[PDB]
Amino acid sequence: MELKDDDFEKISELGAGNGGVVFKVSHKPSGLVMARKLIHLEIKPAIRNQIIRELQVLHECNSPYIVGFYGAFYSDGEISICMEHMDGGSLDQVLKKAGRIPEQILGKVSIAVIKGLTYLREKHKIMHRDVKPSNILVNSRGEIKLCDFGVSGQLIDSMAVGTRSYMSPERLQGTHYSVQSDIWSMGLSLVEMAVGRYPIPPPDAKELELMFPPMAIFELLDYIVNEPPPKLPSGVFSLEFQDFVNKCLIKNPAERADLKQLMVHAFIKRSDAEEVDFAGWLCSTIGLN
Amino acid sequence: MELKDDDFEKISELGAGNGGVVFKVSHKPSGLVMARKLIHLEIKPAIRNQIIRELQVLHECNSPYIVGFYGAFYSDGEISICMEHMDGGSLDQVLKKAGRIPEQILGKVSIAVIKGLTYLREKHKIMHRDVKPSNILVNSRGEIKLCDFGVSGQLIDSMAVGTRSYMSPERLQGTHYSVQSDIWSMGLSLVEMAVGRYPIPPPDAKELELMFPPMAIFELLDYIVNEPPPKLPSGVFSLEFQDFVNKCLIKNPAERADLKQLMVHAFIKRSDAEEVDFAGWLCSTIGLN
Ligand SMILES: Nc1ncnc2c1ncn2[C@@H]1O[C@H](COP(=O)(O)OP(=O)(O)OP(=O)(O)O)[C@@H](O)[C@H]1O
Numbered sequence: 348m349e350l351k352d353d354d355f356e357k358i359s360e361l362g363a364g365n366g367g368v369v370f371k372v373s374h375k376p377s378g379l380v381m382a383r384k385l386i387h388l389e390i391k392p393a394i395r396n397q398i399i400r401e402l403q404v405l406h407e408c409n410s411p412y413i414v415g416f417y418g419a420f421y422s423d424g425e426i427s428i429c430m431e432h433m434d435g436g437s438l439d440q441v442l443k444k445a446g447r448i449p450e451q452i453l454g455k456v457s458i459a460v461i462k463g464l465t466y467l468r469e470k471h472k473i474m475h476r477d478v479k480p481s482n483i484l485v486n487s488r489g490e491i492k493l494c495d496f497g498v499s500g501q502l503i504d505s506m507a508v509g510t511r512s513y514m515s516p517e518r519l520q521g522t523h524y525s526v527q528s529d530i531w532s533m534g535l536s537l538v539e540m541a542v543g544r545y546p547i548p549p550p551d552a553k554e555l556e557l558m559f560p561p562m563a564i565f566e567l568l569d570y571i572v573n574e575p576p577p578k579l580p581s582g583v584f585s586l587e588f589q590d591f592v593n594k595c596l597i598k599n600p601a602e603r604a605d606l607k608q609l610m611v612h613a614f615i616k617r618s619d620a621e622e623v624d625f626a627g628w629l630c631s632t633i634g635l636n
Numbered sequence: 637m638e639l640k641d642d643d644f645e646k647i648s649e650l651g652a653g654n655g656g657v658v659f660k661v662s663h664k665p666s667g668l669v670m671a672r673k674l675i676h677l678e679i680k681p682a683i684r685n686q687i688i689r690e691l692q693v694l695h696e697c698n699s700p701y702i703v704g705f706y707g708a709f710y711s712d713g714e715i716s717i718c719m720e721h722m723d724g725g726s727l728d729q730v731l732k733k734a735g736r737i738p739e740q741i742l743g744k745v746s747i748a749v750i751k752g753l754t755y756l757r758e759k760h761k762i763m764h765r766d767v768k769p770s771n772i773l774v775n776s777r778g779e780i781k782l783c784d785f786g787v788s789g790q791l792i793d794s795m796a797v798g799t800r801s802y803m804s805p806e807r808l809q810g811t812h813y814s815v816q817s818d819i820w821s822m823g824l825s826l827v828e829m830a831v832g833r834y835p836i837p838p839p840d841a842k843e844l845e846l847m848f849p850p851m852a853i854f855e856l857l858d859y860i861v862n863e864p865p866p867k868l869p870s871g872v873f874s875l876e877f878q879d880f881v882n883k884c885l886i887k888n889p890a891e892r893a894d895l896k897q898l899m900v901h902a903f904i905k906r907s908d909a910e911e912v913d914f915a916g917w918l919c920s921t922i923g924l925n
Pocket residue numbers: 361362363364365366367368369382384414430431432433434436437440481482484494495509
């Protein structure tokens with residue numbers, strides 16, 4: 348079915364960030380509950396047709412680790428991307444309510460992210476460009492999926508920040524970056540969710556006793572590229588998980604691990620075997636089922 | 637009169653940037669045409685009342701170099717700031733249509749910015765925090781006014797970027813900045829409008845013959861703080877204007893000129909005396925009257 352503006356009704360507000368909000372909505376003709384992202388773009392009528400055309404590849408992006416797609420269209424001033432509604436929300440939201448996320452839970456998350464990035468690269472020959480806690484969605488069925496990836500080249504152009512960067516050192520410095528940049532973003536996201544707050548700058552010795560102002564714009568980005576990367580605090584986290592994020596946060600992208608090597612890492616192998624009721628822990632911390 | 641959501645009607649769209657759009661609107665009860673900025677903020681009901689309370693000082697901000705204020709209120713999801721509609725639009729828009737802006741015209745602009753910043757500091761003890769071509773509005777009467785300044789401390793907190801920085805070196809590096817940061821922003825804006833494009837990085841010798849890719853995020857901000865500041869190209873611009881922006885773009889904020897010294901600069905003294913029909917040139921380049 349072709350999605351259309353007048354066939355929708357606003358239920359509630361799922362959230363917002365650095366632009367247009369996304370609503371919980373009701374596609375009246377199907378009765379299906381969906382999430383509707385609106386991206387306002389002050390753009391000519393020619394290239395906005397190209398954006399919808401390039402967004403049709405999301406129909407062919409079928410995967411359990413990828414957020415579902417129903418269709419895209421231009422209403423009046425803003426393009427629309429309609430997707431599977433994930434009742435658990437994004438991982439930045441569940442980190443707020445949970446304080447920290449257990450290492451065991453982040454194991455299952457890492458499996459979902461690696462398999463999602465792997466699907467996009469092999470089947471669709473594209474990178475994510477925006478891996479962070481807010482673009483990793485979860486639901487009550489226990490599913491962990493990825494949204495907001497770069498399928499349309501024209502949309503990447505039309506939207507080219509925020510005071511929290513998950514961008515790799517190489518992407519920050521210039522145009523010499525590609526799929527490895529996503530690995531850095533994943534590693535930094537995992538350190539954030541494990542520790543309870545954004546990892547840069549790193550906590551001093553005295554701050555780590557409590558758990559177990561904000562930086563200026565240039566101050567933050569200078570730390571990422573020049574100062575040594577964020578490690579995970581020893582003792583409370585296992586050696587396998589410590590080495591996993593260490594491999595993900597190697598400044599040099601060619602020296603840094605890729606999806607191939609991380610898939611066969613000791614941390615992922617152990618996490619696959621583990622009996623983890625992710626659906627139960629998710630509903631316990633946010634309160635749903 | 638108290639402004640209210642249901643007493644409004646959308647005429648058209650004046651523009652957008654890094655957030656909510658601003659509409660040309662009709663306040664039905666008064667019949668007055670206004671500009672209505674909507675700032676969506678995912679914020680608690682307690683502190684949003686504080687933001688409206690702090691925005692009431694805009695009523696007392698009466699000045700010919702400051703954009704008029706009618707009132708502010710919380711509708712449903714987004715706060716509203718209602719202001720004088722400036723039919724000429726912002727200076728970034730008129731720079732696009734004009735290619736370059738004459739030195740003589742930028743003289744009159746500089747007078748408006750200095751007198752607007754001076755009014756805010758002396759009478760209201762506050763700084764702008766966001767001087768750039770988009771926050772300098774003009775109209776058919778020939779008026780040049782300033783909008784989008786920091787009157788509410790709580791609103792500054794709730795909104796704390798874009799790939800074009802007008803932030804001073806000191807503000808980029810840390811918290812050690814104040815009213816002098818506005819001077820840098822003014823200087824960089826004047827170089828942009830004079831030359832036809834964003835001054836960083838500076839044009840090479842061969843690019844300046846034509847007139848008379850984009851940088852990465854860290855690449856841009858590293859140029860601002862470490863590499864020498866942007867000069868104005870000699871020959872086509874006068875020595876007075878060259879020294880004016882040179883004083884505005886001194887990296888060291890204490891060494892850099894303040895509003896006092898710039899008011900008595902040779903460039904401003906000459907620009908005051910000059911017979912410049914700003915209203916005629918404005919309507920000629922954008923097409924209005
Ligand atoms: N399909 C979805 N299901 C449930 N919630 C969603 C969905 N898509 C987005 N959201 C929620 O809406 C919020 C806003 O998403 P959006 O992509 O607009 O910005 P963001 O990713 O949060 O931050 P940024 O603008 O910095 O990328 C997210 O934090 C998320 O919680």
